[PDB]
Design an enzyme around this catalytic site. Structure first.
Site, mmCIF file in Angstrom:
data_model
loop_
_atom_site.group_PDB
_atom_site.id
_atom_site.type_symbol
_atom_site.label_atom_id
_atom_site.label_comp_id
_atom_site.label_asym_id
_atom_site.label_seq_id
_atom_site.Cartn_x
_atom_site.Cartn_y
_atom_site.Cartn_z
ATOM 1 N N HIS B 17 3.780 7.244 7.622
ATOM 2 C CA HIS B 17 3.243 6.298 8.604
ATOM 3 C C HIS B 17 2.969 7.014 9.939
ATOM 4 O O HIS B 17 1.954 6.751 10.566
ATOM 5 C CB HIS B 17 4.230 5.146 8.846
ATOM 6 C CG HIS B 17 4.533 4.316 7.638
ATOM 7 N ND1 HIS B 17 5.825 3.916 7.347
ATOM 8 C CD2 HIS B 17 3.694 3.807 6.702
ATOM 9 C CE1 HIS B 17 5.735 3.180 6.253
ATOM 10 N NE2 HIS B 17 4.474 3.098 5.820
ATOM 11 N N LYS B 41 8.760 -10.535 0.728
ATOM 12 C CA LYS B 41 10.109 -10.073 0.394
ATOM 13 C C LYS B 41 10.839 -9.833 1.708
ATOM 14 O O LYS B 41 10.254 -9.251 2.629
ATOM 15 C CB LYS B 41 10.057 -8.780 -0.432
ATOM 16 N N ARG B 90 -2.530 7.134 0.148
ATOM 17 C CA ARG B 90 -1.739 8.225 -0.422
ATOM 18 C C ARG B 90 -2.305 8.507 -1.813
ATOM 19 O O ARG B 90 -3.115 7.717 -2.301
ATOM 20 C CB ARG B 90 -0.262 7.831 -0.497
ATOM 21 C CG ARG B 90 0.240 7.244 0.805
ATOM 22 C CD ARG B 90 1.657 6.805 0.661
ATOM 23 N NE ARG B 90 2.546 7.658 1.440
ATOM 24 C CZ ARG B 90 3.070 7.315 2.607
ATOM 25 N NH1 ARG B 90 2.818 6.121 3.133
ATOM 26 N NH2 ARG B 90 3.869 8.148 3.249
ATOM 27 N N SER B 128 7.889 3.445 1.723
ATOM 28 C CA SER B 128 9.144 2.916 2.294
ATOM 29 C C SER B 128 10.047 2.401 1.163
ATOM 30 O O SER B 128 11.255 2.606 1.227
ATOM 31 C CB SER B 128 8.894 1.766 3.263
ATOM 32 O OG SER B 128 8.346 2.195 4.492
#
Ligand SMILES: CC1=Nc2nc(N[C@H](CC#N)c3cccc(Cl)c3)nn2C(=O)C1
Ligand SMILES: CC1=Nc2nc(N[C@H](CC#N)c3cccc(Cl)c3)nn2C(=O)C1
Ligand SMILES: CC1=Nc2nc(N[C@H](CC#N)c3cccc(Cl)c3)nn2C(=O)C1
Ligand SMILES: CC1=Nc2nc(N[C@H](CC#N)c3cccc(Cl)c3)nn2C(=O)C1
Ligand SMILES: CC1=Nc2nc(N[C@H](CC#N)c3cccc(Cl)c3)nn2C(=O)C1
Ligand SMILES: CC1=Nc2nc(N[C@H](CC#N)c3cccc(Cl)c3)nn2C(=O)C1
Lengths: 160, 160, 157, 157, 160, 157
Positions: B17, B41, B90, B128
């Site tokens: 990030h 979530k 990515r 993450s």
């Protein structure tokens, strides 16, 4: 006299689903739009709401029957005397999952053929889950839904 | 005077990030690192912890503003007078999902351009969620995080 | 209902036979359409490819094998076909398949592209791979109809 | 800010016009860079490709069309560009795009590769598909600027 | 004397898993079939049931040891003196996830090599989750499981 | 245990060195097998490719470099190899890799295809990309063994 089933949660039915079922009616004599009664994740709309919405949105298509089901889609196809199972393939579809499902459906009912249809470019990048997530976050989704579905989704989110 | 938003959950902010937001500052005059207040979530870190961590980790970048948001990212971009939405790509990104999100964001705000940046090869295979899963299972993740984030993640897991 | 199954079929494999057999169980008449495809520089001439596919599909009463050098959408219109069959093995092909199907729809909107999935048995082969193996004297009998296998052996001899 | 949009543009399509238009709304100056690309054996010469892209982008005040045979990172350095634009349609291209972008970064670390997404309208076309359809006398007017359509018709005549 | 670990939830062990572990025994001297004790999602079968089933299904393979674990698979490999980590790659595998996992495992234990094996075409389109979902919906999954697993899955669903 | 690592290796890169090094840490003897590959029209002759790979792997005691024009499964049988090594960088290659591995299994069922993942450092390069960059006078020293870099410079000079 070929009979095809088009299964899904249709929670809610979108213009992408309408596009797919319309293409299916131009190919097969009888199309059963089959709505999953009890999905893994609790649906936004009840089965009755989902059936009523899909019925109104497909009324103009004379050879569509909207029916709810709770069994395996291959068992449902066998009971409906259907030899064709329709799956829509959007540009954003999980192709790996489609292969698993089709090979499993073939193991369960070898005479049942999985048929992949492609929606219009217009609906190739949407899903009911993306539409709902945008709608829950106050985004404009009118363009992606039949009028009756747009009115029902507005009413659902007004009281949520 | 181009303004860009870089949205995400940043739960916690990683070196991937940091790499993305640094590349964005070299291209655009003002970058808003936008942290999602209420994700689907429940996050590991509260919004205040996530904002504080991202602020400390980007302090050396003069044209970064760290802000929390709870609305649609397109609405947030419109309110921030931003015409650019940054997404990191990515090697392990879900490209199909990126296409859906970008096409939906374009439907909601057509003047808002989605821009994909590529991180360093070093951060091309992390997320993450992978970092947290490894950390929850007592794995070494120091290499993937800014120092302040590593100290906060150690403190979080000590009391969990 | 008339369906067209176009391709280079250079040569026709058991995977192509699997697809065309599934198509005959769904549609009244199936046209297996062999594209001249000179840009791909085929191993077999169009006449050889037509003859081989005819012999390999003879047991299927509702298959007609025809060659074409036309735009496939124009050929489908001329065959009075409203269905265009394409076989789907994996994700990589699915992308070019989307381009082709969207272009065919632009050229002929009433022509529907349908995708069929072959047996797991033929999900990892292609005419190109079979030819490559046969060029290095590898055994490819399992992947081809008998008549195709003998013609491929004769061609490489 | 100066951005370069490199490619073979053989010929330039509405998908390429869509990308370069989005780029002009983001950056002050956009260089549409046409690679000679002799290994791809292009249909149109570099001069034809430059002339066509110039005419098709004339309505965009901050676009400069230039040809190059150089390494694209060296060309970007020489154009004083710090942004390299690439259009993204689907997953299959995204892989080669990652290789190219990581190589360009190795050669010029201060040059940032940015990926733009075209309109859904142009998400299933390519110069290759348009040329293939045009070679079989298919209608491709919808996919090309007018000047490109006439040049492609004249080239195949 | 190469030792390999083959980790997973094996909930339940399928013919695809048997195919993979058999190929691994033909390559390496000692194979540890490692069963995840506490996965994120609650398993259908307890760890004891999963261990007992995998033990019975691999008994004919002399160099397989069935063991439960609750730590990081890289830590478990280090403690088992294993330098090889086996992953099956079906046609329907999430390759992007395999790359993340392998690169993370390499960061945690650089001397541990991730090795990808390919199952038979017969098991290339199945997973334990698809088998269970079909079984929960009264579908025939006998073909995908060892006999002992089929008997245990029938007994599990009889009382659910 | 004997493992074979086949490929065109035109030329051998640091990504190939990374793969073969991982293979030597797992298997007792590794055969780096260089395919003649005339259909790909290689830049370097088979003798040049063998000489280069020999020099680049000399520091690895259990690597044998050998050329072949045979079917790779027949070559693996003749080398008494029961393991076939293939390097895996991304999803796009993984599909052709599945076809090749399933075909190799059909030809030789006791030969196991194993897939190794290279370092992140070499996950975005290929011999093709390195050659393309070198043809445009781009710096590729970082991606190649020294001896390969000098041979590629001499070849393009
Ligand atoms: C091979 C498979 N066949 C299957 N049939 C069903 N049927 C249910 C019926 C209900 N409620 C269902 C649930 C959710 C969506 C749909 Cl479309 C259908 N699930 N299912 C699988 O997951 C796999
Ligand atoms: C087209 C879409 N636009 C969207 N904007 C948001 N905003 C929320 C804000 C909060 N909390 C959010 C939640 C989680 C992660 C992020 Cl990055 C952002 N969600 N969202 C969609 O799911 C789809
Ligand atoms: C939308 C498109 N329409 C097209 N029509 C044709 N026709 C030729 C006939 C010849 N030779 C052909 C060549 C190769 C394979 C096939 Cl199946 C058909 N090619 N073509 C495209 O590539 C795209
Ligand atoms: C990292 C790389 N750098 C490179 N520079 C060039 N330059 C040529 C110029 C000419 N002819 C070119 C050829 C084709 C398309 C483009 Cl856009 C550019 N090719 N190239 C690579 O393929 C990879
Ligand atoms: C880099 C990673 N290494 C990891 N090791 C584990 N171990 C647990 C052990 C237990 N219970 C586990 C849980 C579920 C399935 C398996 Cl196969 C293993 N999880 N894990 C990651 O998620 C990521
Ligand atoms: C299942 C297959 N078996 C095969 N054996 C060969 N052998 C040649 C030897 C030469 N020249 C070769 C060519 C290119 C790369 C390699 Cl690694 C090997 N090719 N081949 C296939 O393409 C498929």
């Amino acid at each position: 006299q070929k009979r095809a089933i088009y299964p899904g949660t249709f929670d809610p039915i979108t213009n992408g689903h309408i596009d797919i079922v319309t293409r299916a009616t131009q190919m097969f004599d009888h199309v059963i739009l089959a709505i999953a009664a009890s999905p893994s994740k609790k649906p936004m709309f009840t089965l009755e709401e989902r059936v009523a919405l899909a019925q109104q949105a497909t009324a103009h298509l004379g050879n569509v029957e909207v029916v709810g089901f709770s069994d395996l889609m291959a068992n449902f196809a066998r009971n409906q005397h259907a030899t064709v199972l329709i799956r829509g393939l959007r540009a954003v579809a999980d192709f790996e999952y489609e292969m698993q499902l089709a090979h499993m459906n073939r193991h369960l009912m070898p005479e049942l053929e999985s048929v992949f249809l492609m929606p219009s470019k217009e609906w190739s990048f949407i899903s009911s889950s993306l539409v709902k997530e945008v709608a829950r976050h106050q985004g404009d989704v009118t363009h992606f839904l039949p009028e009756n579905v747009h009115q029902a989704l507005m009413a659902k989110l007004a009281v949520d």
